[PDB]
Amino acid sequence: PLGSPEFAAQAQALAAQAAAAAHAAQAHRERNEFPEDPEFEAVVRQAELAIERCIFPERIYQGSSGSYFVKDPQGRIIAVFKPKNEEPYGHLNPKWTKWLQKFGRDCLVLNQGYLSEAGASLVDQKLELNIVPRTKVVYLASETFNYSAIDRVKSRGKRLALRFNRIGLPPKVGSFQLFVEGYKDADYWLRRFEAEPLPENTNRQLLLQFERLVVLDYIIRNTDRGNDNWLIKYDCPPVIKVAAIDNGLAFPLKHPDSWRAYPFYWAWLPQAKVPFSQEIKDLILPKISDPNFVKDLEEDLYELFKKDPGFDRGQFHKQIAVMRGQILNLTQALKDNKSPLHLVQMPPVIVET
Amino acid sequence: PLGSPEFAAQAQALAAQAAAAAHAAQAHRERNEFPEDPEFEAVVRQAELAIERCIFPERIYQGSSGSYFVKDPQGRIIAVFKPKNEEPYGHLNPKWTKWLQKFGRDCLVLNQGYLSEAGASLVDQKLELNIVPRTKVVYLASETFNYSAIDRVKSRGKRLALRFNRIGLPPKVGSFQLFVEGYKDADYWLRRFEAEPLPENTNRQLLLQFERLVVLDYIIRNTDRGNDNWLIKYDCPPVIKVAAIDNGLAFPLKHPDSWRAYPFYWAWLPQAKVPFSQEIKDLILPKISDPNFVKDLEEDLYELFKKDPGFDRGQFHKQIAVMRGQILNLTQALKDNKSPLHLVQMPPVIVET
Amino acid sequence: PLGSPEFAAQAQALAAQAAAAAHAAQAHRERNEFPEDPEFEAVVRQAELAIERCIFPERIYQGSSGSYFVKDPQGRIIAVFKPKNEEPYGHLNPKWTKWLQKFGRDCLVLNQGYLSEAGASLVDQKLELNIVPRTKVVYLASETFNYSAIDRVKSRGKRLALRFNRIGLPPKVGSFQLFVEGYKDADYWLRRFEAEPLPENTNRQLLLQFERLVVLDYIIRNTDRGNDNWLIKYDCPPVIKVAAIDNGLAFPLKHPDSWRAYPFYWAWLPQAKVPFSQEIKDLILPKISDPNFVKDLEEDLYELFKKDPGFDRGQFHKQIAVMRGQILNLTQALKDNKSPLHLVQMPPVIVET
Amino acid sequence: PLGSPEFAAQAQALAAQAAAAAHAAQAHRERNEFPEDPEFEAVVRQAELAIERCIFPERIYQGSSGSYFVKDPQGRIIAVFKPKNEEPYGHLNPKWTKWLQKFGRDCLVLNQGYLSEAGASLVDQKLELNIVPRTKVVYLASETFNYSAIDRVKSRGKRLALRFNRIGLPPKVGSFQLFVEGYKDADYWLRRFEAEPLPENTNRQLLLQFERLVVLDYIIRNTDRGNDNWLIKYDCPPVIKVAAIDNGLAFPLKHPDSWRAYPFYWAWLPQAKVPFSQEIKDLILPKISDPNFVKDLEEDLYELFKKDPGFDRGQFHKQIAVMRGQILNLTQALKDNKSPLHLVQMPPVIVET
Amino acid sequence: PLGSPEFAAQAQALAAQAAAAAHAAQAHRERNEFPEDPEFEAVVRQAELAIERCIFPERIYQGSSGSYFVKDPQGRIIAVFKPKNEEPYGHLNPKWTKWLQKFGRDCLVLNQGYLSEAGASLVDQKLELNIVPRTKVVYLASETFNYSAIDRVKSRGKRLALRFNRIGLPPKVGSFQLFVEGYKDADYWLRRFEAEPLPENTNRQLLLQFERLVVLDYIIRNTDRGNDNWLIKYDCPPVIKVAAIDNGLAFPLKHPDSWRAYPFYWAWLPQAKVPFSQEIKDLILPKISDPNFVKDLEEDLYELFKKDPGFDRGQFHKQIAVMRGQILNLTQALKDNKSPLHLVQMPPVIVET
Ligand SMILES: Nc1ncnc2c1ncn2[C@@H]1O[C@H](COP(=O)(O)OP(=O)(O)O)[C@@H](O)[C@H]1O
Ligand SMILES: Nc1ncnc2c1ncn2[C@@H]1O[C@H](COP(=O)(O)OP(=O)(O)O)[C@@H](O)[C@H]1O
Ligand SMILES: Nc1ncnc2c1ncn2[C@@H]1O[C@H](COP(=O)(O)OP(=O)(O)O)[C@@H](O)[C@H]1O
Ligand SMILES: Nc1ncnc2c1ncn2[C@@H]1O[C@H](COP(=O)(O)OP(=O)(O)O)[C@@H](O)[C@H]1O
Ligand SMILES: Nc1ncnc2c1ncn2[C@@H]1O[C@H](COP(=O)(O)OP(=O)(O)O)[C@@H](O)[C@H]1O
């Protein structure tokens, strides 16, 4: 039926279902479905429920203006949410970037903080580090988010969607990180471990966790890690855990012009001088020294980063070339028993494919 | 010294002081000075003080999204504030209006609500009606106003102005109306005065006040007056007062295309059938039937409306021509003992100068 | 003679001499005259002489591509020269910057490295620190500088200027820093002073010099100071000196978005914990805590920065506002006997005029 | 399978391999492969090797700025290299040429010197003259070539390509001519042969070689042949050879507006008055008087000239029409025993197809 | 007071009165004042009066769509009115004409019919022919004129101008010709004078009038004169008069490309063969053969033609150059006793100044 009526009708059968698919693409996303992580999805529903019951997320007070504590219906904090459009450069949406170079000193893509934040968690899972609290790209609407004058007015009138859904403020895409309880700024503890040293067993545990922090921040080439930016939880009577929490400024697209800019602040710690353990070597080497893993990782990141209205395939290859070079350095340092300090001293490399 | 060095230096003496004047024009305005109404200025300082002490204005809950209850340092409400840029059409700032007609059905200027609001009070004062609570154009900055992502971030860092003023969020221009206490929606009372009629003396007082409402709304050709939009205060053991409160949609630039659109809802009330009193006649006629008063009024409005970044001298003349025609009708109705109802039935007139 | 022939001829007398002045503006500059520093001028002539005798400046081998060792006619190094147009972003000359924001994460002006470099020396002199080797804006032409294909060809033919000057390659504007002899990377010594501590008197001298480094880098808010970027000279049988040498990335126009970015690497040294001395206090406070000095400094920088084809008065005020805030912090820390470490911990401030 | 899944997968099998082909087109070229001339390829590898070992090509001192002596790893000169982008008009790359006429006096294409240079050698081979030293289009990267500021900086960081190739400065396309040893400027010898005449046998040999020069320069309508521009090698105890070396200004697209412009300087020599030999007639006539040879030649040149980013099919036909007219004149002169002098006196002809 | 306050106030005294003058320029014109012809003005008032009393001008039925019979308040016809904007090419008002040639076959200016019509009458008066009924440029508003949808709607609402004038439909500029009574198409009579010849005295009178028609049409180079286009009035018991009535297609800006195009249809009449009389010679020669008269005429036309929004000084000089050439021919023919027929046979001349 290459030129038949039967086929002409088959082609319209596809044309109308493909046009319906594209109409229902925004609502499908905003449904926040995670077949792969039912546990994360449940948290999101708790967040949605709380909002219907008018227990809203609240701005983090001394934080940057664009991040909120998501609460459950009981008032407990359950997540940190950071909307894309409330990021520093969350304006200038009409891609202007291609007119700009057809630059520059800046080495991060303009408005993809939430993606960096989500990418970190992704890298974490694939590497099995379990230090970044599960964070994913989520849509949420709430009175307390920063909307424009028009959005706020346009949302007064009663609106229904047609399965008769009420519509309020538009949902915001953002990163949604599981909230972890009882941690403090890493430096608070590290200086306390300077007066009281820890028992050796606990200290061995701290270092094991620290190595995972180092691996994560190095592969994603985090741009903004201080010693207040990662967290340690220690309860005396005896576990110690680190959480990597603020990962919105990673995945750069080139190494910084100056090597002095954007240091990894954990490199000045004494912990950084301790050679990589055997444990970290056989958790990480079987992975990063296999092209298929790195291929698979790169495809995963591609999937995640595609989401963005401003995604640029050119930029993405630059991002992956940087990360490839980081993986390469890490492999060597892992093989030759180097320490985190030696690792950060290796010269930046780019690997083009 | 027509071409001398003495004059050349005199000319630079003016050129640098004129350039300083223009640099300091925004800070001068944002200082909110009212030599003419020291009482109003004091209220504003109370509002500024409360904000420094972190008692912020709060959104009016069931109102439109862009209006706030300004509180004093004790928590009492002292004003209603409505920022220009939080009005419905408070975007599209780059005047695009001239490219648009070089249209249309719309009969109000795009983003001058606060000016209408302030103009009402101005007309009120000049006419000596005392029904609009004193409202003026004021600048205010506060955490609870709707700022953009960038403004909120840009304001984290410590900024000083050089007399070392701290700088937080940018001040917003808006209308600042004195808050009046113990009124209810006009219809709440009017229907209660339908079961209980009032004692005749009080009723005479209500009508006297009502006539002033009618005069005000007619001269400014209010577009949006319901019987919930004006307020009556009545305390039994015996005064009755009206307040005209929501005047953001007045001063149109042409009469509505249809006469049925935008009625004055008070015209359906029985009160509207009562002929104008003598009292209102000799309060209003000595004024509006004298070209100098109307000239002086027009100059005052010009002064106030100039303030706006988008002010258009063309539009302004259209606004004044409408108001001139309203004044003209009002004069006749005032002379011939017509009622508010007859007045609103007269045909719309425009008076071009 | 306000409309006379005498004046008409006087006006043409000015019009032709003003047009000659503008023709001869480039040649006047390229003459490299320094009435204020005859000693510096002499060095420049030695540099010019060496070039005529075909002893050329040579690229600094492991340095960035745009810097040269200027040699005298005997082959000794006498200066470091860094051409404007060989800086990283030394292309994109047609100011495009105003079309770009009418952005961004970048906090340095695009192509003014040589100006930062010269500004450092300027600040140094005015403050009387004597740690930056005298560096100024100089023009030089040489075979070994990076010219374009056209410049190189266009310069084959014999060209004379009319006082019959030969013309070769076009002179390049750049920064010209006096070369200092016998220093090493600051970290080379600092780690040697970790094994051998110094005699206390010498150590007191090191610290005195260090404080001057701290003052300089803080006021110009250097963006790129490591502990390899400044130099210490120590000859045992007993003086010790610091030189501040690589100052091309200073004078930013806003504080960095993240406080973690661009640290002052000397803040992690133990020397940084030592409270400011009395000596530094009465060298620096009588100066920076007097508005006229700061006014005079700001005018000097204005003079220097004007030179640039891309100078922007808007950017310049941003640069001065940052530096004003740095001065302000420094003053406090100087008054309250704080250390360099405490100083760098103070929050970034901007001071707008 | 005209609309099958099998074919849809076959079509994607081609679409991805065609997209890979286009990605790997630049690296394929820069690999400098010459299956047809293994001997030339070997020289190129020697050149590449020398560069890795840091024995760089060096600018020809009294030559034009864009030509280099390529050295082998032992320091012997092995080639002359002339980069495209270092030619006089090697800027203005964004084809502007079509906007210019939709002109002019100029009769050479803008930036195809290296192509003229390579085309000469091509014509030489096909004609079997063996006077142009084998020259081809080659890519080379080297510190000593004229790169831009950005290229030089961008190349500091370590870059790998993925078969893990290091990347330094970008390779430059250019012409790569085999270096020939022991020749002098043709005029040096010709004036020496004016005092000492040569033995008749050697002189017969010189003339035989000269005729080949004449044939070559005439068919490619060289624009820039002096008597210093071609070379003679003569070693007394007895061979004599000519080399045609500087062929970057040939293959014009129209005859010069004036016949007096661009002469062939060898036409004023006495040698030019000697009638064409029989030897040259039966080497050249069986070739140029056969449409298939001329068709085949034209296709070869097309192949070579296509390479260029700025190739224009319009210009190319103009180039071939000129050369066709030259071939036509040459044929006549060859048939009628004319001399080089008579040949150059014939009127310029164009032959359009 | 060359730079005094007295003069600064004098300059504002002029600036405000000059701005008032320009505001009141349209209303001044639309007042239709004719101090020079009080008799014509009176007719216009009768026309205005009739319109107020709702006796409207009516479209001329078999005429072109843009002409009306103006009636007095009694219903008698008193004028013919032809609005500018109801002419054939009365659209395309935004001068596009200059973009068009920076053409063409067309030899009349685009939209100046009413001006031609008024110019004819002007030429008539100055020449003292008295055959064109007094026609001038007049403004009139009426329901029966062709207005646009918007004008018709915009005029429903009551509008006043401030001396409280009512405003209805906008006045139209047009030509206003006095209506003459009892004429017929010239050909109706001419063919009747072919059967009945006239008494010789009357015939002498006809010819005298005819000569004046010829003079008029020739000097203005009428483009559209048939023998139905001019009128003869003859009442038997004995005067005969001609009226020249339809003069909207005159004053061309170049002679027609073909001499056969646009003939003067009266040239085929036998009357045209009669030599010019003495009477016409001493009425017309003392005038047109004197440069001052022709200068004065040209200035008058300039005055009249300036009125038009689309007036072009370039076109006007072309119009005058044609008319100068016509005057020149006419003079000769007048001097040498030629007839109208010989006159029209003379070759077209242009006279440039
Ligand atoms: N997943 C998390 N669980 C618990 N606490 C968190 C988490 N993420 C952030 N926080 C805490 O809340 C604050 C959030 O700030 P951060 O994540 O740095 O973003 P921002 O600086 O943009 O506000 C931090 O001070 C940190 O102590
Ligand atoms: N000056 C005032 N004094 C006291 N109450 C006021 C005043 N202005 C408004 N209100 C009350 O607060 C609410 C403010 O809403 P309104 O002024 O209509 O603006 P919006 O509808 O934009 O919120 C009204 O419901 C009214 O009852
Ligand atoms: N004024 C100076 N006197 C002596 N040595 C210098 C001077 N300036 C720089 N140097 C030395 O030469 C090198 C120049 O590099 P630097 O000034 O950092 O610029 P870049 O990094 O752009 O080459 C440094 O390694 C430093 O050791
Ligand atoms: N293939 C070659 N073999 C040997 N010497 C050459 C060759 N090509 C050029 N030369 C010599 O080196 C110089 C190169 O200059 P030339 O080829 O004319 O180009 P340019 O004039 O652009 O430098 C010439 O003076 C010539 O003597
Ligand atoms: N001034 C006038 N007096 C009397 N009748 C006139 C006058 N002008 C025109 N007419 C008559 O009315 C008609 C008007 O048409 P005309 O003037 O030719 O313009 P159009 O052809 O554009 O309608 C003519 O047929 C003519 O007979």
From Swiss-Prot, chains A, B, C, D, E:
Changing R191E: Reduces enzyme activity, probably due to impaired membrane-association. It comes from the Eukaryota. It is found in: Golgi apparatus, trans-Golgi network membrane; Membrane raft; Cell projection, Dendrite; Presynaptic cell membrane. Changing K95A: Abolishes enzyme activity. Changing R191A: Reduces enzyme activity. It catalyses: a 1,2-diacyl-sn-glycero-3-phospho-(1D-myo-inositol) + ATP = a 1,2-diacyl-sn-glycero-3-phospho-(1D-myo-inositol 4-phosphate) + ADP + H(+). ATP binds at Y61, Q62, G63, S64, S65, G66, S67, K82, Q177, L178, F179, V180, D246. Residues 221-229 are annotated as: Catalytic loop. Residues 54-353 form the PI3K/PI4K catalytic domain. Changing L249A: Abolishes enzyme activity. The keyword ATP-binding applies. Changing D185A: Reduces enzyme activity by half. One of its GO terms (cellular component) is cytoplasmic vesicle. Palmitoylated by ZDHHC3 and ZDHHC7 in the CCPCC motif. Palmitoylation is cholesterol-dependent, and required for TGN localization. Ubiquitinated by ITCH; this does not lead to proteasomal degradation. It is a lipid-anchor. Its main location: Golgi. Residues 60-66 are annotated as: G-loop. Associates with the BLOC-1 and the AP-3 complexes; the BLOC-1 complex is required for optimal binding of PI4K2A to the AP-3 complex. Interacts with BLOC1S5 and DTNBP1. Interacts with FOS; this interaction may enhance phosphatidylinositol phosphorylation activity. Interacts with ITCH. Interacts with ATG9A. This is Phosphatidylinositol 4-kinase type 2-alpha. It comes from Homo sapiens. The lineage of its organism: Eukaryota, Metazoa, Chordata, Craniata, Vertebrata. The chain holds residues 78 to 453 of 479 of the full protein.
